[PDB]
Design an enzyme around this catalytic site. Structure first.
Site, PDB file in Angstrom:
ATOM      1  N   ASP A  24       0.796  -1.225   0.000  1.00 56.36           N
ATOM      2  CA  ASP A  24       0.000   0.000   0.000  1.00 56.36           C
ATOM      3  C   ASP A  24       0.831   1.279   0.000  1.00 56.36           C
ATOM      4  O   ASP A  24       0.640   2.144   0.870  1.00 56.36           O
ATOM      5  CB  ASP A  24      -0.910   0.026   1.224  1.00 56.36           C
ATOM      6  CG  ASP A  24      -1.739  -1.247   1.377  1.00 56.36           C
ATOM      7  OD1 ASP A  24      -2.241  -1.776   0.359  1.00 56.36           O
ATOM      8  OD2 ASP A  24      -1.884  -1.687   2.527  1.00 56.36           O
ATOM      9  N   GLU A 225     -11.543   0.386  -3.460  1.00 54.05           N
ATOM     10  CA  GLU A 225     -10.646   0.852  -2.408  1.00 54.05           C
ATOM     11  C   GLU A 225      -9.592   1.760  -3.041  1.00 54.05           C
ATOM     12  O   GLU A 225      -9.737   2.161  -4.194  1.00 54.05           O
ATOM     13  CB  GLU A 225      -9.998  -0.355  -1.712  1.00 54.05           C
ATOM     14  CG  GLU A 225      -9.263  -1.350  -2.642  1.00 54.05           C
ATOM     15  CD  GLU A 225      -8.769  -2.605  -1.893  1.00 54.05           C
ATOM     16  OE1 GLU A 225      -8.708  -2.575  -0.648  1.00 54.05           O
ATOM     17  OE2 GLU A 225      -8.418  -3.612  -2.541  1.00 54.05           O
ATOM     18  N   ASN A 288      -4.651  -7.591  -4.759  1.00 54.58           N
ATOM     19  CA  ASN A 288      -5.167  -6.243  -4.695  1.00 54.58           C
ATOM     20  C   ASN A 288      -4.168  -5.268  -5.322  1.00 54.58           C
ATOM     21  O   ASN A 288      -2.983  -5.582  -5.491  1.00 54.58           O
ATOM     22  CB  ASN A 288      -5.648  -5.842  -3.277  1.00 54.58           C
ATOM     23  CG  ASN A 288      -4.588  -6.009  -2.204  1.00 54.58           C
ATOM     24  OD1 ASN A 288      -3.466  -5.523  -2.329  1.00 54.58           O
ATOM     25  ND2 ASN A 288      -4.966  -6.670  -1.111  1.00 54.58           N
ATOM     26  N   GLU A 359      24.451   6.279   4.435  1.00 52.89           N
ATOM     27  CA  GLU A 359      24.052   5.191   5.314  1.00 52.89           C
ATOM     28  C   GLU A 359      24.335   3.849   4.631  1.00 52.89           C
ATOM     29  O   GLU A 359      24.119   3.701   3.428  1.00 52.89           O
ATOM     30  CB  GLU A 359      22.562   5.306   5.625  1.00 52.89           C
ATOM     31  CG  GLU A 359      22.160   6.573   6.406  1.00 52.89           C
ATOM     32  CD  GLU A 359      23.051   6.825   7.612  1.00 52.89           C
ATOM     33  OE1 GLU A 359      23.397   5.867   8.361  1.00 52.89           O
ATOM     34  OE2 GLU A 359      23.413   7.994   7.803  1.00 52.89           O
ATOM     35  N   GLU A 361      22.546   1.372   5.017  1.00 54.28           N
ATOM     36  CA  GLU A 361      21.165   1.016   4.616  1.00 54.28           C
ATOM     37  C   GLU A 361      20.626   1.872   3.447  1.00 54.28           C
ATOM     38  O   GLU A 361      19.432   1.836   3.140  1.00 54.28           O
ATOM     39  CB  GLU A 361      20.225   1.098   5.823  1.00 54.28           C
ATOM     40  CG  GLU A 361      20.002   2.527   6.369  1.00 54.28           C
ATOM     41  CD  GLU A 361      21.010   2.937   7.454  1.00 54.28           C
ATOM     42  OE1 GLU A 361      22.136   2.370   7.539  1.00 54.28           O
ATOM     43  OE2 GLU A 361      20.670   3.866   8.224  1.00 54.28           O
ATOM     44  N   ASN A 383      17.837   5.895  12.846  1.00 51.78           N
ATOM     45  CA  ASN A 383      19.001   5.336  12.163  1.00 51.78           C
ATOM     46  C   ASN A 383      19.001   3.821  12.187  1.00 51.78           C
ATOM     47  O   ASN A 383      18.781   3.202  13.233  1.00 51.78           O
ATOM     48  CB  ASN A 383      20.299   5.862  12.796  1.00 51.78           C
ATOM     49  CG  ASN A 383      21.556   5.292  12.131  1.00 51.78           C
ATOM     50  OD1 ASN A 383      21.645   5.201  10.902  1.00 51.78           O
ATOM     51  ND2 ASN A 383      22.543   4.939  12.945  1.00 51.78           N
ATOM     52  N   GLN A 384      19.257   3.235  11.024  1.00 50.72           N
ATOM     53  CA  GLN A 384      19.283   1.788  10.875  1.00 50.72           C
ATOM     54  C   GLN A 384      20.712   1.298  10.652  1.00 50.72           C
ATOM     55  O   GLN A 384      21.635   2.106  10.514  1.00 50.72           O
ATOM     56  CB  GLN A 384      18.423   1.365   9.689  1.00 50.72           C
ATOM     57  CG  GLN A 384      17.000   1.895   9.731  1.00 50.72           C
ATOM     58  CD  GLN A 384      16.103   1.093  10.643  1.00 50.72           C
ATOM     59  OE1 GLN A 384      15.854  -0.096  10.392  1.00 50.72           O
ATOM     60  NE2 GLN A 384      15.569   1.745  11.695  1.00 50.72           N
ATOM     61  N   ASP A 480      26.817   0.613   9.408  1.00 50.01           N
ATOM     62  CA  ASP A 480      25.921   1.585  10.052  1.00 50.01           C
ATOM     63  C   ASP A 480      25.970   2.663   8.922  1.00 50.01           C
ATOM     64  O   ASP A 480      24.945   3.088   8.391  1.00 50.01           O
ATOM     65  CB  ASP A 480      26.399   2.228  11.353  1.00 50.01           C
ATOM     66  CG  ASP A 480      25.641   3.544  11.664  1.00 50.01           C
ATOM     67  OD1 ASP A 480      24.443   3.713  11.265  1.00 50.01           O
ATOM     68  OD2 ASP A 480      26.254   4.434  12.287  1.00 50.01           O
TER      69      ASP A 480
HETATM   70  O1  LIG Z   1     -12.117 -12.249  -6.969  1.00 50.10           O
HETATM   71  C1  LIG Z   1     -11.371 -12.557  -8.028  1.00 50.10           C
HETATM   72  C2  LIG Z   1     -10.072 -12.213  -8.125  1.00 50.10           C
HETATM   73  O2  LIG Z   1      -9.355 -12.604  -9.329  1.00 50.10           O
HETATM   74  C3  LIG Z   1      -8.183 -13.356  -9.017  1.00 50.10           C
HETATM   75  O3  LIG Z   1      -7.536 -13.764 -10.229  1.00 50.10           O
HETATM   76  C4  LIG Z   1      -7.218 -12.497  -8.201  1.00 50.10           C
HETATM   77  O4  LIG Z   1      -6.136 -13.327  -7.755  1.00 50.10           O
HETATM   78  C5  LIG Z   1      -7.845 -11.829  -6.970  1.00 50.10           C
HETATM   79  O5  LIG Z   1      -7.092 -10.646  -6.674  1.00 50.10           O
HETATM   80  C6  LIG Z   1      -9.332 -11.437  -7.054  1.00 50.10           C
HETATM   81  O6  LIG Z   1      -9.924 -11.623  -5.758  1.00 50.10           O
HETATM   82  C7  LIG Z   1     -10.018 -10.414  -4.995  1.00 50.10           C
HETATM   83  O7  LIG Z   1      -8.757 -10.103  -4.393  1.00 50.10           O
HETATM   84  C8  LIG Z   1      -8.733  -8.857  -3.692  1.00 50.10           C
HETATM   85  C9  LIG Z   1      -7.321  -8.676  -3.143  1.00 50.10           C
HETATM   86  O8  LIG Z   1      -7.170  -9.191  -1.810  1.00 50.10           O
HETATM   87  C10 LIG Z   1      -9.797  -8.818  -2.585  1.00 50.10           C
HETATM   88  O9  LIG Z   1      -9.884  -7.497  -2.034  1.00 50.10           O
HETATM   89  C11 LIG Z   1      -9.752  -7.499  -0.613  1.00 50.10           C
HETATM   90  O10 LIG Z   1     -10.978  -7.926  -0.028  1.00 50.10           O
HETATM   91  C12 LIG Z   1     -10.791  -8.424   1.292  1.00 50.10           C
HETATM   92  C13 LIG Z   1     -12.168  -8.577   1.927  1.00 50.10           C
HETATM   93  O11 LIG Z   1     -12.472  -9.976   1.939  1.00 50.10           O
HETATM   94  C14 LIG Z   1      -9.705  -7.620   2.067  1.00 50.10           C
HETATM   95  O12 LIG Z   1      -9.738  -7.750   3.521  1.00 50.10           O
HETATM   96  C15 LIG Z   1     -10.877  -7.191   4.215  1.00 50.10           C
HETATM   97  O13 LIG Z   1     -10.626  -5.823   4.567  1.00 50.10           O
HETATM   98  C16 LIG Z   1     -11.652  -5.271   5.393  1.00 50.10           C
HETATM   99  C17 LIG Z   1     -11.511  -3.754   5.415  1.00 50.10           C
HETATM  100  O14 LIG Z   1     -12.484  -3.166   6.284  1.00 50.10           O
HETATM  101  C18 LIG Z   1     -11.533  -5.865   6.796  1.00 50.10           C
HETATM  102  O15 LIG Z   1     -12.729  -5.559   7.523  1.00 50.10           O
HETATM  103  C19 LIG Z   1     -11.295  -7.386   6.803  1.00 50.10           C
HETATM  104  O16 LIG Z   1     -10.092  -7.696   7.521  1.00 50.10           O
HETATM  105  C20 LIG Z   1     -11.268  -8.070   5.424  1.00 50.10           C
HETATM  106  O17 LIG Z   1     -12.566  -8.642   5.193  1.00 50.10           O
HETATM  107  C21 LIG Z   1      -9.279  -6.235   1.488  1.00 50.10           C
HETATM  108  O18 LIG Z   1      -9.931  -5.142   2.141  1.00 50.10           O
HETATM  109  C22 LIG Z   1      -9.446  -6.123  -0.038  1.00 50.10           C
HETATM  110  O19 LIG Z   1      -8.271  -5.594  -0.660  1.00 50.10           O
HETATM  111  C23 LIG Z   1     -11.174  -9.301  -3.064  1.00 50.10           C
HETATM  112  O20 LIG Z   1     -12.017  -9.556  -1.930  1.00 50.10           O
HETATM  113  C24 LIG Z   1     -11.053 -10.582  -3.888  1.00 50.10           C
HETATM  114  O21 LIG Z   1     -12.321 -10.922  -4.452  1.00 50.10           O
HETATM  115 CA    CA Z   2      22.812   3.862   9.414  1.00 48.60          CA
HETATM  116 NA    NA Z   3      -2.955   4.715  -0.312  1.00 45.61          NA
END
Ligand SMILES: OCC1O[C@@H](O)[C@H](O)[C@@H](O)[C@@H]1O[C@@H]1O[C@H](CO)[C@@H](O[C@@H]2O[C@H](CO)[C@H](O[C@@H]3O[C@H](CO)[C@@H](O)[C@H](O)[C@H]3O)[C@H](O)[C@H]2O)[C@H](O)[C@H]1O
Ligand code: CA
Ligand code: NA
Ligand code: NA
Length: 487
Positions: A24, A225, A288, A359, A361, A383-384, A480
């Site tokens: 992210d 998102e 994602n 650095e 690093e 510092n790392q 360092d």
């Molecule tokens: O669905 C088909 C698909 O195609 C495939 O070829 C790919 O490999 C996939 O990327 C794709 O599936 C989707 O993949 C994305 C990436 O992770 C998902 O988005 C995430 O959705 C989940 C929710 O299930 C995540 O986690 C959730 O976050 C909420 C935030 O409030 C949190 O409450 C909880 O911890 C979780 O439920 C992320 O938020 C998204 O990035 C798709 O769901 C998935 O279909």
């Molecule tokens: Ca350093």
């Molecule tokens: Na962002």
């Protein structure tokens, strides 16, 4: 071997780092450097020690790296953002937050002094902010409750109140974009997939740690998102990740980065099309998509993530992500060209000066070491040092300019129990040997000494490899910073 690069291979610029993970990403451009802030992706395992899919359990810190040249990255370590549930060993900053997902970063001059604001999502429930007087901290929670919650005016219909993007406009007004998710729980209707209406924009107060008025809905077609905002030729570009469900038309392809334009930061926005395919399209599989568009040293780029390091290590990405940057191009009509995401990445934009303190690093390539926060006296904030150094490991910098006159000597700050050597080589890990520094036993891994040794034959522009040797296991020495001196 190791010895060998994991995923970021000598001469390539993506992923940005490969000695640990970073999801992210967001960018801050500040006084000649770009800083990238990242969710703290970190492997989760089954009890038998086998890898399992990322469940975001480790997303409680923010990793920060920076560069002046797009190739050499300084590792600034981790900000222990989350402080709830004993997270970060009692040293977490936001005591109310159990998580710190998907950072955003802003700088604004306040009372004559540049102030920095780091925004983050406490999972899907609220957005917080920390403040600092430098891009790398130290950080303060001036609230500490969330900044934005579902009770904030205009935010009630948001499914996932997360993925903040903060923009400071030319007039100094800050704006926060956030939200996502698709309404309808387990089974959204086609129309819910097509118009989730879960994206929001709200004006921030002058202090950047409060909001004004109410949030406005951004009707992003097929919203999921990953809110983003950039400003190009007086037009505001709202970008986001398109969702994966329902049927999609040709112009809103699932899991790709879409964008909309407006003459105003709060809209109305008009959908324009889509400029970054799913990382799975380029690097195999899928996952994602998270991104930020930015202008650094007069060029437009996009930072994004892909599962390129985890895949190289495990043979499957498993949801563990790494930062990449590629160029982004705006057309004459203001539309954006499809980004050519790849491993080559961005060619180095400026040479590195090896005559300043650099650095350890700060490196472009490595095989294969770790970085951690450093017990060395002095140094920059957080510092790392380079650690997990075994015989035949190495780090390298891209395009150090030794100049026509070249280098006289090489200094390194090191800590070692048993000692070892640092070979300084040009162009390749087996390249021209210009010097070797003998690392003595210093008294221990937390006892530091700056050592100097001669170099000869180091003139002009070269990649520089620091190759580590010694006998015995495990860690030969910690390392360092370094500095060359001029002839
Ligand atoms: O669905 C088909 C698909 O195609 C495939 O070829 C790919 O490999 C996939 O990327 C794709 O599936 C989707 O993949 C994305 C990436 O992770 C998902 O988005 C995430 O959705 C989940 C929710 O299930 C995540 O986690 C959730 O976050 C909420 C935030 O409030 C949190 O409450 C909880 O911890 C979780 O439920 C992320 O938020 C998204 O990035 C798709 O769901 C998935 O279909
Ligand atoms: Ca350093
Ligand atoms: Na962002
Ligand atoms: Na190592």
């Amino acid at each position: 071997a190791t010895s060998t690069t994991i995923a970021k291979h000598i001469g390539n610029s993506n992923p940005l780092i490969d000695h640990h993970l970073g999801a992210d990403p967001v960018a801050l451009t500040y006084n000649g450097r770009v800083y990238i802030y990242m969710s703290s992706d970190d492997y989760e395992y089954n009890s038998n020690g086998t890898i399992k899919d990322n469940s975001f359990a480790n997303l409680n810190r923010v990793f920060v790296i920076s560069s002046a040249d797009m190739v050499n990255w300084t590792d600034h370590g981790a900000i222990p953002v989350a402080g709830a549930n004993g997270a970060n060993g009692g040293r977490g900053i936001a005591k109310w937050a159990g998580a710190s997902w998907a950072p955003s970063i802003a700088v604004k001059k306040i009372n004559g002094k540049d102030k920095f604001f780091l925004y983050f999502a406490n999972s899907g429930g609220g957005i917080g902010v920390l403040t600092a007087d430098s891009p790398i901290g130290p950080w303060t929670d001036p609230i500490g409750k969330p900044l934005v919650t579902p009770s904030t005016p205009g935010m009630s219909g948001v499914v996932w109140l997360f993925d903040p993007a903060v923009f400071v406009d030319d007039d100094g007004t800050g704006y926060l974009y956030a939200g996502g998710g698709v309404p309808g729980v387990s089974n959204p209707t086609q129309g819910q997939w097509a118009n989730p209406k879960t994206a929001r924009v709200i004006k921030l107060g002058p202090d950047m740690t409060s909001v004004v008025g109410s949030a406005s809905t951004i009707d992003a077609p097929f919203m999921f998102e990953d809110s983003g905002l950039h400003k190009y030729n007086g037009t505001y570009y709202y970008s986001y990740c398109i969702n994966f469900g329902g049927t999609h038309p040709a112009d809103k392809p699932p899991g790709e980065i879409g964008y909309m334009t407006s003459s105003s930061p709060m809209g109305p926005f008009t959908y324009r099309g889509h400029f970054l395919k799913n990382p799975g399209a380029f690097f195999g599989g899928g996952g994602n998509n998270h991104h930020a568009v930015f202008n650094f040293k007069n060029e437009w780029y996009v930072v994004y993530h892909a599962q390129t390091v985890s895949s190289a290590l495990f043979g499957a990405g498993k949801g563990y992500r790494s930062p990449h940057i590629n160029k982004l191009v705006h057309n004459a009509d203001g539309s954006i060209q499809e980004v050519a995401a790849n491993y080559a990445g961005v060619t180095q934009i400026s040479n590195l000066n090896p005559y300043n303190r650099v650095e350890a690093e700060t490196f472009a390539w490595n095989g294969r070491i770790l970085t951690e926060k450093s017990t060395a006296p002095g140094g920059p904030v957080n510092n790392q040092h380079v650690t997990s150094i075994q015989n035949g490991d190495w780090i390298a910098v891209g395009n150090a300019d030794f100049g026509a006159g070249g280098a006289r000597s090489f200094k390194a700050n090191v800590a070692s129990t048993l000692g070892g050597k640092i070979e300084v080589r040009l162009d390749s890990a087996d390249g021209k040997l210009v010097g070797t520094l003998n690392v003595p036993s210093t008294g221990g891994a937390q006892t530091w000494r700056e050592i100097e040794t001669a170099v000869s034959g180091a003139t002009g522009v070269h990649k520089v490899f620091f190759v580590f040797t010694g006998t015995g296991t495990g860690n030969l020495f910690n390392f360092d910073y370094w500095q060359f001196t001029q002839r």
